[PDB]
């Protein structure tokens, strides 16, 4: 599994604990888990940075008298969302993952959907890169940006739970 995607940077194939050398047949599940984590992390990092200088106009509920511009930046912004809005967000995520972008087949654990690639959701109406060098570069860029976004989103979460902002002190 040393020649697969993600083993491109200065470290080559970097598996210290050896998850995929102990179980080489478990690489596809780990790749799907990493790809979902990376995509959620890119969305989270972009939301963290963009909510600081961009805010929607108008109200959020028009019943709890809560504005888009009144939610501060972060965890407290998710606090001030009304319970119906939280229910709708969870319904959107559940419908988005259980049926539309389905990362897992199988009864309980979820292997990989058929003979597709790990993280090969959406389908049909999605850009399919030909020219395998370009496809390999695009996929490796996706994976590496996902990993960097995981670390960044974790750091901003660590900052937000001990401050009022995700910006570290001194910045």
């Amino acid at each position: 599994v040393e020649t697969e995607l993600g083993a491109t940077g200065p470290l080559g194939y970097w598996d210290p604990f050896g998850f995929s050398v102990r179980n080489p047949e478990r690489f596809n599940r780990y790749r799907a888990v990493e790809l979902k984590h990376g995509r959620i992390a890119m969305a989270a990092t972009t939301g963290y940075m963009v909510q600081s200088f961009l805010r929607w106009p108008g109200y959020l509920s028009t019943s709890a008298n809560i504005k888009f511009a009144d939610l501060p930046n972060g965890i407290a912004a998710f606090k001030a969302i009304p319970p119906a809005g939280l229910f709708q967000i969870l319904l959107f995520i559940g419908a988005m993952e259980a049926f539309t972008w389905r990362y897992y087949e199988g009864p309980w654990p979820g292997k990989v959907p058929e003979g597709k690639a790990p993280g090969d959701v959406a389908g049909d109406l999605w850009v399919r890169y030909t020219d395998p060098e370009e496809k390999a570069f695009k996929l490796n860029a996706e994976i590496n940006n996902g990993r960097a976004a995981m670390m960044g989103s974790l750091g901003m979460l660590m900052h937000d739970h001990i401050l009022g902002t995700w910006v570290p002190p001194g910045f």
Binding site: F53, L54, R128
Partner: protein
């Protein structure tokens, strides 16, 4: 060769709409050129409609657009979508035009409009050319509606009473 294109719309019964016969005697390397001009107008009009809606709803950025001479993003947004176009400093307009022109020069030297009829080689969301022709027709119809809409917005903001169903 104008009968091929993509632009045959079912709203005019799936035939070419040229009442003035502007494409009767135009030849290739000009038909592709006018298609590229139409496509660029489509894309700029869609982006313009979205930006106009964002400014009219009020959204704007947070900060100071040019700290030397005042002018915040709230100051630009509060003047309106049309009257808040001269509130931007001239250096910002020239920098925006310079970046857009650099992109224009790069894409024109890479994909000439006379040879490539509006195709700059952006990925592509589908194979199966029938579906791709349907998506091309959707892009053309959306861009034409946006072409009408942005000029409608500019007319309704400048001349009141025109465009009766204009929000804001």
């Amino acid at each position: 060769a104008v009968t091929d294109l993509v632009g045959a719309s079912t709203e005019v019964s799936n035939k070419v709409w040229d009442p003035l016969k502007l494409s009767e005697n135009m030849d290739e390397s000009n038909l592709k050129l006018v298609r590229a001009a139409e496509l660029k107008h489509c894309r700029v009009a869609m982006l313009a409609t979205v930006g106009w809606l964002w400014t009219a709803t009020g959204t704007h950025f947070e900060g100071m657009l040019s700290t030397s001479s005042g002018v915040s993003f709230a100051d630009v947004a509060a003047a309106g979508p049309l009257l808040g176009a001269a509130k931007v400093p001239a250096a910002g307009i020239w920098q925006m035009i310079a970046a857009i022109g650099a992109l224009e020069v790069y894409w024109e030297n890479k994909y000439p409009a006379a040879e490539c009829g509006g195709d700059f080689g952006v990925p592509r969301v589908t194979q199966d050319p029938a579906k791709f022709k349907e998506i091309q027709l959707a892009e053309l119809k959306n861009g034409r509606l946006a072409m009408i809409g942005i000029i409608s917005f500019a007319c309704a903001e400048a001349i009141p009473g025109s465009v009766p169903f204009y929000p804001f």
